Amino acid sequence: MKVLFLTANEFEDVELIYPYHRLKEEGHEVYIASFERGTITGKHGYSVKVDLTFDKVNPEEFDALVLPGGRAPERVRLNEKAVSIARKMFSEGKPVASICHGPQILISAGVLRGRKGTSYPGIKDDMINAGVEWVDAEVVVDGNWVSSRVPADLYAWMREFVKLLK
Amino acid sequence: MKVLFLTANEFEDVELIYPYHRLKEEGHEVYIASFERGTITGKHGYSVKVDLTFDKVNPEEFDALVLPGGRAPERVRLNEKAVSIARKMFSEGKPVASICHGPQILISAGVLRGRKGTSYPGIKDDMINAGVEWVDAEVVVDGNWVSSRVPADLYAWMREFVKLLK
Amino acid sequence: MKVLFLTANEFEDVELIYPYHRLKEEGHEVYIASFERGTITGKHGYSVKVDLTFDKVNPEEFDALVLPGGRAPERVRLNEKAVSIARKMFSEGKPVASICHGPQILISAGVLRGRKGTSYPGIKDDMINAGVEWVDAEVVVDGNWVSSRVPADLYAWMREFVKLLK
Amino acid sequence: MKVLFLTANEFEDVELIYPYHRLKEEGHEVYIASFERGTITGKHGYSVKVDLTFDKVNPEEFDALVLPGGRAPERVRLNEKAVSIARKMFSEGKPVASICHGPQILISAGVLRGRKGTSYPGIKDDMINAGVEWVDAEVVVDGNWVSSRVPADLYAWMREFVKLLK
Amino acid sequence: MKVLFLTANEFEDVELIYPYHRLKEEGHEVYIASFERGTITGKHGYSVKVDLTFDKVNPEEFDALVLPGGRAPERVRLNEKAVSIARKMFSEGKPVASICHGPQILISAGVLRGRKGTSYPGIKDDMINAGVEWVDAEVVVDGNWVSSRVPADLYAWMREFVKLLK
Amino acid sequence: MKVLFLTANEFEDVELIYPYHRLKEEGHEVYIASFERGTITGKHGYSVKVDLTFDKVNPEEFDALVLPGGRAPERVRLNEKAVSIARKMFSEGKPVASICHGPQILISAGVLRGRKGTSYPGIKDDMINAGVEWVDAEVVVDGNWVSSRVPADLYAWMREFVKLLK
């Protein structure tokens, strides 16, 4: 499996680094996509290398999608290509894992109406206004969409996501 | 005029400090409400004194409302009392100034359907999903609601808001 | 009216940003002059664009002068061109607004003997030794010179300065 | 299984948080021991709750040991009780995972002579002088001792460690 | 000899720590005086213990005076007692070492007219307005007054000061 | 005398700056060597200019060696040229001053077996495993090697080291 991450500067550090390594443990290949080649830096100062830009991403070449939180989703969701990647992969039924502010990208992709999931509670109302049946739970599994709220949910988040890739 | 601010830790410093002094210049009384008495600190390290808590606010003794941005609105909008203050003052047609993430509180108050305004572009889709006719402009005036996007808009934001007050 | 700001890195953030937007509100054009083109960053991390260098400034093309505080004035006052700009505009009777450490530039310009004003209390003795009648007040108006002490004075500072610009 | 963490302020954040959640996913109980009850903060500013003090640890009540790195090991290795915990658990053949500066605690326990492992390259000379056959590899498995070097090794580090706990 | 330091929070770290240790090498006793007991923290984050408060200082019980720079002198020079200490010791001819912003305290003590010395170049004009013959030199010795400009001058500053205490 | 400093980014600021100026006071010439030309920045944010790279150092052109602490030694000790410089100067019996983590470089040079000295207590066991008779004292003098533990020891450290360069 090839796993794509859509992220940018000001990502929540552990919400990117934890699924990155957890999926590598399984032997999946993990790819970080962002605006520009080079490095990006998290809220807490961890730097990670960008593997490819949004413009170079063909969503048909990836099997699953991870959306870390932080402040990066509010910039990534203004990128028509990045939102388009999320829309197609989510629409095709490929596994999509979101945590915290991550699902702001899915809101912008227009794919969440009638779906069930969670997010950082601070944006629950925006999830609800997008048509999500929002629940306060450490992990929600709604078909291909695995969603969690905060870094304390990491263990449950990837426990469920890893099952979807098996 | 008595002007109420709803804010918290991690407010955007100049988005609070600028209207605070701009409205003081006009002779209005300005009040900072937050979760707890004491002080709150902005994203950039400015400290501000809290005048009263959300719980102690009677919205009928205030004439106008200011909603600065930063990360504070995502905390403030989870406080039922703070959201009701904004809902009541806005629905009564009292002047309400919002900037950046400030209008997340108005989203949560359920008052934006059919209204016209702007915000930090990063949350445009959330404004639109709440029923806002979202405009990309340095300042928008929709009756009692004066909205702006980013600190570069400060001059235009209060230029319009000061007109609504007396 | 064209309003010039003389400043540099380590400016006190709100002492620059507040009058910048307050005077823009009136429709005045505002210009930031510093050592180099590019950007400068305040004590608290706000960045602002430099419009022109001290060397490119013709003081005859500007109508008023604003001197924000911070650590920048102790650097600007060593620049002979910057001090000559302040000397020429102040002695010509053009409106000059200073706050906090701002008037260190006026001290070095040699224009303060016999004047009345205020500053950050920490440099009260240096103002006095320059011949200033130093007053502990939120704003002082001495002809063309409007002076204040600290960020808490911003509202009164620009309230008085805006009057001088009509 | 009950898994014990020995750590303190200035731990390398992901080197604690990653194995913490990875082992929770398996259903193991994880416990953070440090000098004082309360919270500890990592190099990058993440806060974690301390479950018990070194004084309260009975090593017979735990099945495995994790030693995150950062600057914390250099303080922990001066604590006679913490070093004793590591000495007893490692010598008993219980699974011990160390990464980066973590094995400085094992150096101080005097248990590494004749063993094979890795560490932050910066302390390879100290590992070698303690009697370690030092290997430059993302993960080494030497009986009960699973060692890795840097955050980039996290996926391999816990891949091998979880096998030992089954 | 007993050497007294007058300083406070935001002292320039090496301008305090360097003479502190340099004079300890000679066998002198060194005392840190500030506003309150406890610790004070320099601009760069070093902490030092306060030995006594300004109120408790009897100037006749100390043989020499050191005035480090930073932002502490602008606060110390507003304390009538601290300024009184400096006034008495300097006017009595006891050795006084100042660097950077340090001499702002001597300016406020009113003892510098007719004297020869240096300072951080940024306050040169304030020194001159206090009546100082200001010299751009790494160290100046004017009787009991040993003055320097910046941290790069430290070696010369204490080279001259230790001679005065022999 | 020409004194060489081996250091890098994240040096303990006062552990470099203090001996730098103390030895300049004696009239010695002081040289900062690091990985690259330009500047390096200490843990506390002090900036110092690099005089030459490790690659350009001819150890025969220097009379004495200073090894400040911080986190720089853990990177410096991985550079074969830097370690060879310390090994050769120490082996020639030239004066070598180390403090805190400084002696990690000497550990890596393999020159400490049978020698007597001290270090940051946190690496006591690594010094002992390198063959050092470790002493808990503010300064130790073992022939050409003058060693100390922490910034609090600075006065005694250079008190003893300066004697070796007379």
Residue numbers in the entry:
A (entry chain E), B (entry chain F), C (entry chain A), D (entry chain D), E (entry chain B), F (entry chain C): 1 to 166
Which text from the study accompanies this structure?
Here, SAXS contrast data from an oligomeric protein and a protein–RNA complex are presented in the presence of iohexol and Gd-HPDO3A, two electron-rich molecules that are used in biomedical imaging and that belong to the families of iodinated and lanthanide-based complexes, respectively. Concentrated solutions of both media readily attained electron densities of 0.44 e− Å−3, equivalent to the upper range of typical protein densities.
Importantly, the experimental CMP (0.438 e− Å−3) was well within the range predicted from the protein sequence (0.420–0.443 e− Å−3) and the linearity of I(0)1/2 indicates that the oligomeric state of P1 was preserved at all Gd-HPDO3A concentrations. Altogether, the P1 data suggest that Gd-HPDO3A molecules are inert towards this protein and their presence (at up to molar concentrations) does not alter either the conformation of individual monomers or the overall oligomeric state and does not generate any appreciable solvation effects or specific interactions with the protein surface. The CMP thus determined (0.411 e− Å−3) was significantly lower than the range of values expected from the protein sequence (0.420–0.443 e− Å−3). In order to probe whether the specific binding of iohexol molecules can improve the quality of the SAXS fits, we generated P1 models with a single iohexol molecule bound in two distinct, opposite locations: either outside or inside the hexameric ring. P1 structures with an iohexol molecule modeled inside the ring improved the CRYSOL fit significantly, in particular in the shoulder region between 0.1 and 0.15 Å−1 (92 mM iohexol data), while the model with an iohexol molecule placed outside the ring decreased the quality of the fit. In parallel, the average electron density of the P1 hydration shell decreases by 10–20% with respect to the bulk at the highest (618 mM) iohexol concentrations.
